[PDB]
Tab-separated table of C-alpha atoms and ligand atoms in Angstrom:
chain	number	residue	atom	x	y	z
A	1	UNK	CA	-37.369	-10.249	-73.301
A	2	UNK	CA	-34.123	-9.214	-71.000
A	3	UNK	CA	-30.196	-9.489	-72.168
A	4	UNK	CA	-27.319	-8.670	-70.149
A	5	UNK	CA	-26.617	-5.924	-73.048
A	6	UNK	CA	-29.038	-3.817	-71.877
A	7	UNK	CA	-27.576	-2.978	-68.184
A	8	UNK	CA	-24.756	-0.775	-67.655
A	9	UNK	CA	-23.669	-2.848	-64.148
A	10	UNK	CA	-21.905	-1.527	-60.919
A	11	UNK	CA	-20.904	-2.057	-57.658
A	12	UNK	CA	-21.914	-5.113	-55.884
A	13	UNK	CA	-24.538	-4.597	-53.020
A	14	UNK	CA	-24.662	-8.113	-51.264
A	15	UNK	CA	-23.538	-11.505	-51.511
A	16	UNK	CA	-26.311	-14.329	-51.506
A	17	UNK	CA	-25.724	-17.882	-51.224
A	18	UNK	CA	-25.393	-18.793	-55.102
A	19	UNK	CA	-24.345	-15.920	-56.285
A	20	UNK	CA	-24.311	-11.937	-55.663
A	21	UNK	CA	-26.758	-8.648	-56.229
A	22	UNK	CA	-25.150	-5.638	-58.273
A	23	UNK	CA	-25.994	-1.947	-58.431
A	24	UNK	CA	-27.522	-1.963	-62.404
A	25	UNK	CA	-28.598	0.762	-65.029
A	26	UNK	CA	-30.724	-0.266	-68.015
A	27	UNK	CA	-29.033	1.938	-70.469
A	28	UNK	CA	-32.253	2.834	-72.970
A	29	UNK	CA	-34.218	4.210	-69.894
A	30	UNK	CA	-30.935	5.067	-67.555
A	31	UNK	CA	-32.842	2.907	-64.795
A	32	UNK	CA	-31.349	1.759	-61.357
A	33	UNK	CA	-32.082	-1.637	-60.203
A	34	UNK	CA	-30.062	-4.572	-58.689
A	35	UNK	CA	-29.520	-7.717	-60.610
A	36	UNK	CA	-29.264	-10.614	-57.857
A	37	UNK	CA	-27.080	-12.853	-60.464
A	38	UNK	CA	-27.223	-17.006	-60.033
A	39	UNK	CA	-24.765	-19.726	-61.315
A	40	UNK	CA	-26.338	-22.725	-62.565
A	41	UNK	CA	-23.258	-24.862	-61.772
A	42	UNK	CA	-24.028	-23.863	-57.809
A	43	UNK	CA	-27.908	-24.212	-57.565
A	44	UNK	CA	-27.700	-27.735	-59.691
A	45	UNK	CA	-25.167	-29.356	-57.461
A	46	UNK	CA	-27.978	-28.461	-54.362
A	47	UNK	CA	-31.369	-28.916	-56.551
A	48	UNK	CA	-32.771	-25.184	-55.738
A	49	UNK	CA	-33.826	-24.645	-59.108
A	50	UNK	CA	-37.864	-25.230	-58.474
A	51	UNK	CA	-37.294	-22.542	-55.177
A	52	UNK	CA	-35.335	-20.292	-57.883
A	53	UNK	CA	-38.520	-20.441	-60.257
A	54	UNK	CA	-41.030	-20.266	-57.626
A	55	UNK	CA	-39.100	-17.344	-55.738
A	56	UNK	CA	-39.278	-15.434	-59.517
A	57	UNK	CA	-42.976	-16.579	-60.045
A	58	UNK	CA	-44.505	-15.398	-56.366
A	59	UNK	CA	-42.327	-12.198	-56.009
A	60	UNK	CA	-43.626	-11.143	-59.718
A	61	UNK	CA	-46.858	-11.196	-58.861
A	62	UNK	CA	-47.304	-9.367	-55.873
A	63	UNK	CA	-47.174	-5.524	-55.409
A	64	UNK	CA	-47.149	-3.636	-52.065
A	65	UNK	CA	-44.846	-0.613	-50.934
A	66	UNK	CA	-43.009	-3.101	-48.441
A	67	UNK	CA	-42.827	-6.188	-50.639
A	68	UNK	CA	-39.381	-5.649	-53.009
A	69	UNK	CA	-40.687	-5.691	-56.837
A	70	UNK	CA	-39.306	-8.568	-59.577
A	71	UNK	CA	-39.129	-6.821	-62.647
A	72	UNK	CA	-38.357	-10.045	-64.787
A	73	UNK	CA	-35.383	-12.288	-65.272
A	74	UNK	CA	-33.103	-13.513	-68.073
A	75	UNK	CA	-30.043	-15.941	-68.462
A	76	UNK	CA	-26.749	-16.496	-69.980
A	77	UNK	CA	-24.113	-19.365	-70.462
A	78	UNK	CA	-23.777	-20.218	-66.677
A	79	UNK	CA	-25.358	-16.978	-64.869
A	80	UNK	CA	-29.302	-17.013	-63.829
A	81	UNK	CA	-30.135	-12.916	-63.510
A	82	UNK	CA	-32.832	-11.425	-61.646
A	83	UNK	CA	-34.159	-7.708	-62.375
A	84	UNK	CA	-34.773	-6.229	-59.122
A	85	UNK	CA	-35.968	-3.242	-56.978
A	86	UNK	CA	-33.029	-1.378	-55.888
A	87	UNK	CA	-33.031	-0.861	-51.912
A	88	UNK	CA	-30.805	2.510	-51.668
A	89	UNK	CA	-30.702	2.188	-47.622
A	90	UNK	CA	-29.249	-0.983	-47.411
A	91	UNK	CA	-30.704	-3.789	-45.079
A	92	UNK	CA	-31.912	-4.332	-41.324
A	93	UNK	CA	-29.071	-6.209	-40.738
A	94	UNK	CA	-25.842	-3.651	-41.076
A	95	UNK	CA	-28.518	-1.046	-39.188
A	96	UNK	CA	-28.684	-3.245	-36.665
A	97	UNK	CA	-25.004	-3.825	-36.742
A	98	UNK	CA	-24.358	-0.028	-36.421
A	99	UNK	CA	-27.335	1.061	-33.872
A	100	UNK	CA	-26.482	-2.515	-31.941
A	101	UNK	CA	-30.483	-2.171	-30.911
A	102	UNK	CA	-33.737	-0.353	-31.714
A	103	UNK	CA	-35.874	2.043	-29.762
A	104	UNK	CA	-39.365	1.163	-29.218
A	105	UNK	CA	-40.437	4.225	-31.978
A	106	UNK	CA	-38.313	2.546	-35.011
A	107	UNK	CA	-38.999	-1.149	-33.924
A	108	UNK	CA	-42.739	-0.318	-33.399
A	109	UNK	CA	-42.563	0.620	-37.245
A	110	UNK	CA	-40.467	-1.869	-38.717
A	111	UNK	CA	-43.086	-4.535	-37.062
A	112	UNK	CA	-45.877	-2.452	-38.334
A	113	UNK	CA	-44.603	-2.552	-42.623
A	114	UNK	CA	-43.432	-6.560	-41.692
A	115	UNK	CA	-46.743	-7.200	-40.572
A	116	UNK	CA	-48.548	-5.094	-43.388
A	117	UNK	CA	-46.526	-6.929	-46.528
A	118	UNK	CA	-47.698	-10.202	-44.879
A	119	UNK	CA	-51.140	-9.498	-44.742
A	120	UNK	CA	-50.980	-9.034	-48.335
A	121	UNK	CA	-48.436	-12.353	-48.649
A	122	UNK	CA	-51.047	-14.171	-46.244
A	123	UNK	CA	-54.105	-13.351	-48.300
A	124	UNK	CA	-52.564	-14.665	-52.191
A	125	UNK	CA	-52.211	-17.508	-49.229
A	126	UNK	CA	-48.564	-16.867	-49.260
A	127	UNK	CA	-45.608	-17.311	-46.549
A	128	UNK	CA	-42.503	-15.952	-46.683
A	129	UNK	CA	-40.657	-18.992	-44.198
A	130	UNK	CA	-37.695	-16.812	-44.066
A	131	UNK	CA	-38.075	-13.340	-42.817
A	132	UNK	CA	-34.660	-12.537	-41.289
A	133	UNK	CA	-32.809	-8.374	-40.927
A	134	UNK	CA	-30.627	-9.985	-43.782
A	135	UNK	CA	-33.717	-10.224	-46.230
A	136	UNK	CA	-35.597	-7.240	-44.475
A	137	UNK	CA	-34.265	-4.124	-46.991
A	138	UNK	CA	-34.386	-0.088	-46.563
A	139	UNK	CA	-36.385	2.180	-49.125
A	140	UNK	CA	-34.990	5.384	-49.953
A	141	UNK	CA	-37.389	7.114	-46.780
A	142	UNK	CA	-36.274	4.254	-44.858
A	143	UNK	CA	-39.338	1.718	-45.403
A	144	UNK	CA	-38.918	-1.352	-44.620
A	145	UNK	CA	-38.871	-3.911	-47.731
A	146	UNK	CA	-39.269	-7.519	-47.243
A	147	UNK	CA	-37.101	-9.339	-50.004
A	148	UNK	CA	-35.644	-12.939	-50.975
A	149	UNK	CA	-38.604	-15.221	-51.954
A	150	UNK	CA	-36.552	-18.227	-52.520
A	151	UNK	CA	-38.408	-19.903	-49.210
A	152	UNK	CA	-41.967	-18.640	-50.001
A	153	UNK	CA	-44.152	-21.102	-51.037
A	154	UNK	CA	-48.157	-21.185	-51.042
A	155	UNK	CA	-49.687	-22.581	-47.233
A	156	UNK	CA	-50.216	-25.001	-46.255
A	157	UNK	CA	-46.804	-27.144	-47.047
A	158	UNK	CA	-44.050	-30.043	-45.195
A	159	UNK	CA	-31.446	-25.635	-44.117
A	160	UNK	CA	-29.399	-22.792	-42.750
A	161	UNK	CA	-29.339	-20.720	-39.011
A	162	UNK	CA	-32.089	-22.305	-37.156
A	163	UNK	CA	-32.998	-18.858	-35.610
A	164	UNK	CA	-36.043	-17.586	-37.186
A	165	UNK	CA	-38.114	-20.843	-37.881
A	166	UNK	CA	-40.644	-22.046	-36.022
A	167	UNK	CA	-40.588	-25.068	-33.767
A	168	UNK	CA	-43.141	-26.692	-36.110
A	169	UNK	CA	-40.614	-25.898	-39.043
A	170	UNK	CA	-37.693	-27.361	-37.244
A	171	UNK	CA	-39.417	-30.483	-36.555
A	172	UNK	CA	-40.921	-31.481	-40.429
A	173	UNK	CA	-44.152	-30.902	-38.845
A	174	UNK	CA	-47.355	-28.973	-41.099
A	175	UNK	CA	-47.052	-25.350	-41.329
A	176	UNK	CA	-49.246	-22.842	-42.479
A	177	UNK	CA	-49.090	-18.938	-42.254
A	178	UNK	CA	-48.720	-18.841	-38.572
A	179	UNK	CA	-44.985	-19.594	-39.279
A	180	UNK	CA	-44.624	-16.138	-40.416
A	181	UNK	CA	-45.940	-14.469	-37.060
A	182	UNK	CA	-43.068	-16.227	-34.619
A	183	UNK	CA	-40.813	-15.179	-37.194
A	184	UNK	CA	-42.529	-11.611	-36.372
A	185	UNK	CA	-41.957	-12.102	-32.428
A	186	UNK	CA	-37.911	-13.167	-33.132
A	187	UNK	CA	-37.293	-10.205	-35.256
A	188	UNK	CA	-39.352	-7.663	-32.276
A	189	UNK	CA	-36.923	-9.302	-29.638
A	190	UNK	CA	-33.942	-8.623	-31.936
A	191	UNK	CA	-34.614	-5.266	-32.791
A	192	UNK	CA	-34.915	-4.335	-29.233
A	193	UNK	CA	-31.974	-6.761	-27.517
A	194	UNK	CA	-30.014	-6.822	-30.387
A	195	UNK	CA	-29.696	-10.589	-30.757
A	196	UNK	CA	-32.422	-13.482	-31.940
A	197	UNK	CA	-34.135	-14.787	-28.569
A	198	UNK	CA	-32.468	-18.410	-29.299
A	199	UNK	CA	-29.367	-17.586	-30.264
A	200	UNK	CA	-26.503	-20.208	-29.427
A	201	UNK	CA	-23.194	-21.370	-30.436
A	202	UNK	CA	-24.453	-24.501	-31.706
A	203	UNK	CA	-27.316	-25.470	-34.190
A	204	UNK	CA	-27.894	-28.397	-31.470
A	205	UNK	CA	-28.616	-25.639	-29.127
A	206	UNK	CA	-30.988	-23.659	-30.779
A	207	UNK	CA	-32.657	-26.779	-31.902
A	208	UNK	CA	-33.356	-27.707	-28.242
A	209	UNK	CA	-34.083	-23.599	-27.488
A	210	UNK	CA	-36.604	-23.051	-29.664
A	211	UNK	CA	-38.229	-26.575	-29.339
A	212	UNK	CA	-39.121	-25.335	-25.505
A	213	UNK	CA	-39.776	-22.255	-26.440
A	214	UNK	CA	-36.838	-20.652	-23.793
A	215	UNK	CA	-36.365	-17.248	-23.545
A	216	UNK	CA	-35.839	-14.081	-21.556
A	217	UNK	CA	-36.322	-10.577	-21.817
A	218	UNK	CA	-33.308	-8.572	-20.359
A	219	UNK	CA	-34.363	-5.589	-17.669
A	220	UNK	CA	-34.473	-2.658	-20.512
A	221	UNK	CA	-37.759	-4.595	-22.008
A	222	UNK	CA	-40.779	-2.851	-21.747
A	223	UNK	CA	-43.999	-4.747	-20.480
A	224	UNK	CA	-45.677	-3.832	-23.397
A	225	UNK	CA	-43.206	-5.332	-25.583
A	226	UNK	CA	-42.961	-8.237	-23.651
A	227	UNK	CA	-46.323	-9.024	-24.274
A	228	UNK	CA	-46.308	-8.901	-28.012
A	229	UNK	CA	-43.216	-10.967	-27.987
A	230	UNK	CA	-44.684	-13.456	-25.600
A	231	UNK	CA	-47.805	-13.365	-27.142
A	232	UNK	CA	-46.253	-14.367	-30.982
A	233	UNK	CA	-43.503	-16.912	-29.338
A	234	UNK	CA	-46.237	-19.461	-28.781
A	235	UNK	CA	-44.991	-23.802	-29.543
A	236	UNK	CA	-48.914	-23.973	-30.885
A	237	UNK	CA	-49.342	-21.711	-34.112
A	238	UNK	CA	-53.632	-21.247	-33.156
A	239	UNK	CA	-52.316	-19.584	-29.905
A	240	UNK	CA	-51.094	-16.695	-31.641
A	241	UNK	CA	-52.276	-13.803	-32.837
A	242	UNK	CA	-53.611	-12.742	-36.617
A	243	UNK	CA	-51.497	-9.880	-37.782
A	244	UNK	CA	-54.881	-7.791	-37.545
A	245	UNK	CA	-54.284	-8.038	-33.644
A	246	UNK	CA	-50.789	-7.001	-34.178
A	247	UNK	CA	-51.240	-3.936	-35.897
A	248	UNK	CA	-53.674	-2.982	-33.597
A	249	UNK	CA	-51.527	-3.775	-30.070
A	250	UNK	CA	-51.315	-1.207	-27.512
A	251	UNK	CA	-47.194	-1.201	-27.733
A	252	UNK	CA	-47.638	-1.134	-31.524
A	253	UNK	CA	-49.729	1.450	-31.783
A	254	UNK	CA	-48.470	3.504	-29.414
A	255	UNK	CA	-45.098	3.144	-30.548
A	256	UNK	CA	-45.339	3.125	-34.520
A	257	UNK	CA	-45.031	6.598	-36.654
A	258	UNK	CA	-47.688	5.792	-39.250
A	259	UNK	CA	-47.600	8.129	-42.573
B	301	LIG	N1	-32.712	-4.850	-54.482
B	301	LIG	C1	-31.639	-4.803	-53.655
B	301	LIG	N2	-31.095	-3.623	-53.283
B	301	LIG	C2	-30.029	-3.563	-52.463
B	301	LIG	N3	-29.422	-4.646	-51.947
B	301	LIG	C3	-29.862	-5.894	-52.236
B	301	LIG	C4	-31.023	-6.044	-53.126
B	301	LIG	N4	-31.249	-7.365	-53.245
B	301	LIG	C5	-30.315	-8.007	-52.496
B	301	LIG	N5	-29.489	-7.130	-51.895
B	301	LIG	C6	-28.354	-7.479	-51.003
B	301	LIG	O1	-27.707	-8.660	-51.485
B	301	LIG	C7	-27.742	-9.715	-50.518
B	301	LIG	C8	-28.438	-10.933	-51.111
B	301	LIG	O2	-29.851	-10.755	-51.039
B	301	LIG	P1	-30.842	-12.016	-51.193
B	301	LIG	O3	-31.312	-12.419	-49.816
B	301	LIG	O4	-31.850	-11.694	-52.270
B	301	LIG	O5	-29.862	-13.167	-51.747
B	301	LIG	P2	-29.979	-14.675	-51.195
B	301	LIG	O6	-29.956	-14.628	-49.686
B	301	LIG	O7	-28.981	-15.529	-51.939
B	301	LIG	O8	-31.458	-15.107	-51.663
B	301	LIG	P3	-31.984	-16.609	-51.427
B	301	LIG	O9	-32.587	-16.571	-50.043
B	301	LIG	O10	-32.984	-16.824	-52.537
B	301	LIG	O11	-30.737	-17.454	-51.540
B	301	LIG	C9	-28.481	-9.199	-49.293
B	301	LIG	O12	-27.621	-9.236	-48.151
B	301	LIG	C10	-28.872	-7.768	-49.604
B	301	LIG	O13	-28.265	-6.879	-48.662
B	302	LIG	O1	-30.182	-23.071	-68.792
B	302	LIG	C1	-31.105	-23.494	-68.126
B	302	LIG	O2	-31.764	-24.560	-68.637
B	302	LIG	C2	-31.558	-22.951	-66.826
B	302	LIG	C3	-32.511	-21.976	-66.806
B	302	LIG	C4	-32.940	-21.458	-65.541
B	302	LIG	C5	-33.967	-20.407	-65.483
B	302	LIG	C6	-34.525	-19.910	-66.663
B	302	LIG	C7	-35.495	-18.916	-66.625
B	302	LIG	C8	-35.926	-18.402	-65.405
B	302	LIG	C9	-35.357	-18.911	-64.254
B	302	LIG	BR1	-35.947	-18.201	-62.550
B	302	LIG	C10	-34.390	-19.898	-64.251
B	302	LIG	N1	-32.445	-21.893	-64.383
B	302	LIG	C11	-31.482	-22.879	-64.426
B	302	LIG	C12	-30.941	-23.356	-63.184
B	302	LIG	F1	-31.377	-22.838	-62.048
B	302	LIG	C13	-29.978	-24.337	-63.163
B	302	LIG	C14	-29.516	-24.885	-64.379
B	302	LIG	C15	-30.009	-24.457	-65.582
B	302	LIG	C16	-30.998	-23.447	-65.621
B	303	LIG	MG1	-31.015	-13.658	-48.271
């Protein structure tokens, strides 16, 4: 249905892993998007194709204001393009990079539209297994958008920085949607320390960090905080919370700016 003939392309926006997004305008309707382009040559010589078809087939499907929309996808000789929603603000990550940390008002938030989009995810019985500030993009009013499907698969089911995964994860072990909520508790420790809560030098390290389950909040770490965080770092994924709980936390909503 798509050609490459029909986008005027730009800038690039971000590099991926197998290849990188561009600023696009479809020239009959003079609409912006981003086209995350692939190379076949690259995701053949790893085997990602099946994640690459399955990212394009969940994120198609769903719609929610903090879920980035798949308009379609196309191909060429040796290039695998995917029509996206362009992101104008950029990601969590470089904000993060600039601010160094988030207050308790913009972190309350940003936990409030993660925890939202999963609901939604959670219910089409969908997790996201990679929810990191580098797939977490900004809206033009700042929303957050989660983004990059390529690890979403349906629950229940059996790579890179060990940081956001859960220990079940790291360990082959069964994992359902639960996996999505620590992921939730290691991005709320981020945004307000302004580092993962396993962080190390070595994969070996975090391996062994987040198989214990070690961590500690430093001084500037609000009680209330440290209870959500504590509360979603549970080793057993029954221990912790539904996302319904979440959203309705003291420190959340206290803290969150809804509409
Ligand atoms: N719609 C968009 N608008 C603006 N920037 C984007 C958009 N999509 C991607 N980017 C940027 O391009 C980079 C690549 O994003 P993405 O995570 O989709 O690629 P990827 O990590 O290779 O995906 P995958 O996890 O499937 O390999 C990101 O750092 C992001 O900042
Ligand atoms: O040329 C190919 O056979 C090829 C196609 C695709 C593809 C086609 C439509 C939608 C999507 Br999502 C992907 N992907 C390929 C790939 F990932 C590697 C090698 C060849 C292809
Ligand atoms: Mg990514």
């Amino acid at each position: 249905q798509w050609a490459l003939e029909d986008f005027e392309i730009g800038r690039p926006l971000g590099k991926g892993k197998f290849g990188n997004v561009y600023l696009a305008r479809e020239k009959q309707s003079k609409f912006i998007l981003a086209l995350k382009v692939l190379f076949k040559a690259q995701l053949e010589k790893a085997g990602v194709e099946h994640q690459l078809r399955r990212e394009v087939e969940i994120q198609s499907h769903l719609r929610h204001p903090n879920i980035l929309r798949l308009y379609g996808y196309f191909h060429d000789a040796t290039r695998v393009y995917l029509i996206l929603e362009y992101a104008p603000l950029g990601t969590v990550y470089r904000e993060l990079q600039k601010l160094s940390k988030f207050d308790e008002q913009r972190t309350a938030t940003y936990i409030t539209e993660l925890a939202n989009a999963l609901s939604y995810c959670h219910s089409k019985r969908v997790i996201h297994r990679d929810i990191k500030p580098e797939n977490l993009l900004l809206g033009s009013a700042g929303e957050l958008k989660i983004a990059d499907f390529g690890w979403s698969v349906h629950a229940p089911s059996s790579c890179g920085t060990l940081d956001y995964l859960p220990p079940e994860m790291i360990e082959g072990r069964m994992h359902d949607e639960k996996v999505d909520l620590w992921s939730l508790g290691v991005l709320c420790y981020e945004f307000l320390v302004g580092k993962p809560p396993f962080e190390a030098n070595t994969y070996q390290e975090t391996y062994k960090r987040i198989s214990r389950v070690e961590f500690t909040f430093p001084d500037f770490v609000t009680e209330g905080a440290r209870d959500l965080i504590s509360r979603l770092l549970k080793h057993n994924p029954s221990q912790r919370p539904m996302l319904r709980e979440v959203l309705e936390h003291p420190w959340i909503t206290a803290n969150s700016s809804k509409p």
